[PDB]
């Protein structure tokens, strides 16, 4: 989603 | 545990370019996000840049934007800051940090934090 | 852009004292807020997170409370460990950091 979201692997 | 190591920080001449690189080990730095986030005297806490775990995203601050370039290498376990550009007020203590694990639905921050390098922009 | 304001910048306290610093934010961030401890020459440490979630590891003398604009970090009796600059972190859009709080050994 947007900058903050989850960046790390699913 | 978690343990991120800075390196690349110097002296260099305005205008001039510099690569911060950081060495991750302790946790799969290929599952997380990572961030830039630099210090000074004059501006405090700052943060400069995130990339996603696989490079796919980055984000920069405005004051920043055109001239860094975030990237990483999953398979050397390394994250970089190419710093073009580079002007006086960019002389900061350079921190990489590493995106805290959550749930699916939340806003990310950071959990931990190397031990910073330092950039000294200055003719 | 979502300003962050810390007060006080100094307090002067001492050990055993029951100590709350506060942080406020120029818009709502719902209870996206971190706290982070930082002591000289030192690189900082997460305290706490979605405004009053204790990071592993961190001692329970700890507390945050707040949601919306207003946020406090409780040390309920302070240790000398403690004396250092603790910063808040929105994190609800971009990231941007407070001014700093430095607990200060009074004398």
């Known amino acids: 989603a947007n900058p903050n979201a989850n960046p790390n692997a699913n | 545990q978690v343990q991120l190591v800075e390196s690349g920080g110097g002296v260099v001449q305005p205008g001039r370019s510099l690569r911060l690189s950081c060495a991750a080990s302790?946790?799969?730095?290929?599952?997380?996000?990572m961030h830039w986030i630099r210090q000074s005297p004059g501006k405090g806490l700052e943060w400069v840049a995130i990339?996603?775990?696989?490079?796919?995203?980055?984000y920069y601050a405005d004051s920043v934007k055109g001239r860094f370039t975030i990237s990483r290498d999953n398979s050397k376990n390394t994250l970089y800051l190419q710093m073009n550009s580079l002007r006086a007020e960019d002389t900061a203590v350079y921190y990489c940090?590493?995106?805290?694990?959550?749930?699916?639905?939340?806003?990310?921050?950071?959990?931990?934090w190397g031990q910073g390098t330092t950039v000294t922009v200055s003719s | 852009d979502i300003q962050m304001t810390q007060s006080p910048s100094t307090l002067s306290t001492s050990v055993g004292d029951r100590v709350t610093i506060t942080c406020r934010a120029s818009?709502?961030?719902?209870?996206?807020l971190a706290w982070y401890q930082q002591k000289p020459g030192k690189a900082p440490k997460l305290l706490i997170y979605?405004?009053?979630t204790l990071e592993s590891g961190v001692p329970s003398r700890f507390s945050g409370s707040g949601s919306g604009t207003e946020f406090t970090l409780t040390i309920s009796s302070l240790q000398p460990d403690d004396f250092a600059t603790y910063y808040c972190?929105?994190?609800?859009?971009?990231?941007?950091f407070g001014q700093g709080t430095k607990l200060e050994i009074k004398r």
């Open positions: 940090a590493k995106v805290w694990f959550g749930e699916s639905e939340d806003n990310y921050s950071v959990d931990v």
């Open positions: 302790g946790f799969t730095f290929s599952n997380f996000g």
């Open positions: 990339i996603w775990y696989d490079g796919s995203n980055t």
């Open positions: 818009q709502s961030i719902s209870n996206w």
């Open positions: 979605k405004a009053s």
């Open positions: 972190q929105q994190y609800s859009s971009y990231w941007t």
